[PDB]
């Protein structure tokens, strides 16, 4: 009885952790959009202070071009990857929410239909059998909602540990390939600057 109240405390928590992760992942993606655009303004002012063309304009426009492409693709891979995966995972929660509440009421109706056992503690056989049909009906409805959730709540909580683990794995790996690749483009820009000065 109290074992299910423990599954609810675990569900309501797992839901908060997940919506918090979505918030902070939307915060991280917005900031990446912010450094991309801010970095692009900086490269554009360089392109203005370079006319006509001196000591490698073709190796400045190319660097500035594929830098924007790296930022552009990295943001999108996080949007279409780890953010979408987290949205679909959180979409599981509103239906389970409605059913946890439905079961709770179906439990009251079961316990009210059951406590009406005073009827068979006199008896009117036509009213006993009428109450039996309303008790058996209440027991089958409660057990339909309860049987499913008793499985689904500890089964969602189990895939929780490996869910946060897989999200951060794919994020850190997209980061690593973006930072390792942009570091090279940044170095090419430096090497073109040293050619000038």
- The stretch among 15-23, 83-91, 111-119, 136-144 that binds a copy of itself (CB under 8 A) is 15-23
Distances (CA, A) of 79 to 26, 32, 64, 134, 168: 9, 11, 23, 51, 14
Q: Which of K ion, a copy of itself, none has residue 123 at its interface (CB below 5 to 8 Å by kind)?
A: none
Shortest distance, position 158 Cβ to a copy of itself, whole Å: 13
Q: Of the candidates 74, 72, 75, 48, which has an alpha carbon nearest to the alpha carbon of residue 60? A: 48
SS3 of 50, please? coil
Shortest distance, position 8 Cβ to a copy of itself, whole Å: 19
User: Does residue 42 interact with K ion by CB under 5 A?
Assistant: yes
CA 106 to the chain's CA centroid: 30
Give, as one character, the DSSP assignment of residue 91: T
**Closer residue to K ion in complex, CB, 98/164:** 164
Give, as one character, the DSSP assignment of residue 49: T
113-144: b (≥16 Cβ within 10 Å) or e: beeeeeeeeeeeeeeeeebeeebeebeebbee
Shortest distance, position 144 Cβ to a copy of itself, whole Å: 33
- Non-local (6+) Cβ contacts of 26 within 8 A are 83
User: Does residue 65 interact with a copy of itself by CB under 8 A?
Assistant: no
Q: ∠71-74-79 over CA atoms, to 5°?
A: 120
Binding mask 137-176 for a copy of itself (x = CB under 8 A): -------------------------x-xxx-xx-xxx-xx
**Residues from 20 through 59 that contact a copy of itself (CB under 8 A):** 20-21, 24-25, 27-28, 30-32, 34-35, 37-39, 41-42, 45-46, 48-49
User: Contact positions toward a copy of itself, by CB under 8 A?
Assistant: 17, 20-21, 24-25, 27-28, 30-32, 34-35, 37-39, 41-42, 45-46, 48-49, 162, 164-166, 168-169, 171-173, 175-176, 179-180, 182-183, 186-187, 189-190, 193-194, 196-197
């Amino acid at each position: 009885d109290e074992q299910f109240e423990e599954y609810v405390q675990n569900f309501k928590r797992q839901e908060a952790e997940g919506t918090r992760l979505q918030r902070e992942l939307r915060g991280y993606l917005a900031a990446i959009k912010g450094m991309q655009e801010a970095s692009m303004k900086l490269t554009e002012s360089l392109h203005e202070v370079y006319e006509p063309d001196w000591y490698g304009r073709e190796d400045v426009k190319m660097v500035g071009e594929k830098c924007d492409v790296l930022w552009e693709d990295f943001h999108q891979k996080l949007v279409d990857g780890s953010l979408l995966t987290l949205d679909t995972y959180l979409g599981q929660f509103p239906d389970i929410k409605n059913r946890i509440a439905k079961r709770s009421r179906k439990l009251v109706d079961y316990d009210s239909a059951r406590h009406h056992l005073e009827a068979l503690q006199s008896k009117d056989e036509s009213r006993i059998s009428k109450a039996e049909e309303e008790f058996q009906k209440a027991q089958k409805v409660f057990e339909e909602f309860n049987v499913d959730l008793q499985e689904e709540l500890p089964s969602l909580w189990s895939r929780r540990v490996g869910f946060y683990v897989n999200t951060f794995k794919n994020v850190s790996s997209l980061e690593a390939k973006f930072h390792k690749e942009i570091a090279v483009l940044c170095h090419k820009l430096y090497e073109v600057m040293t050619k000038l000065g």
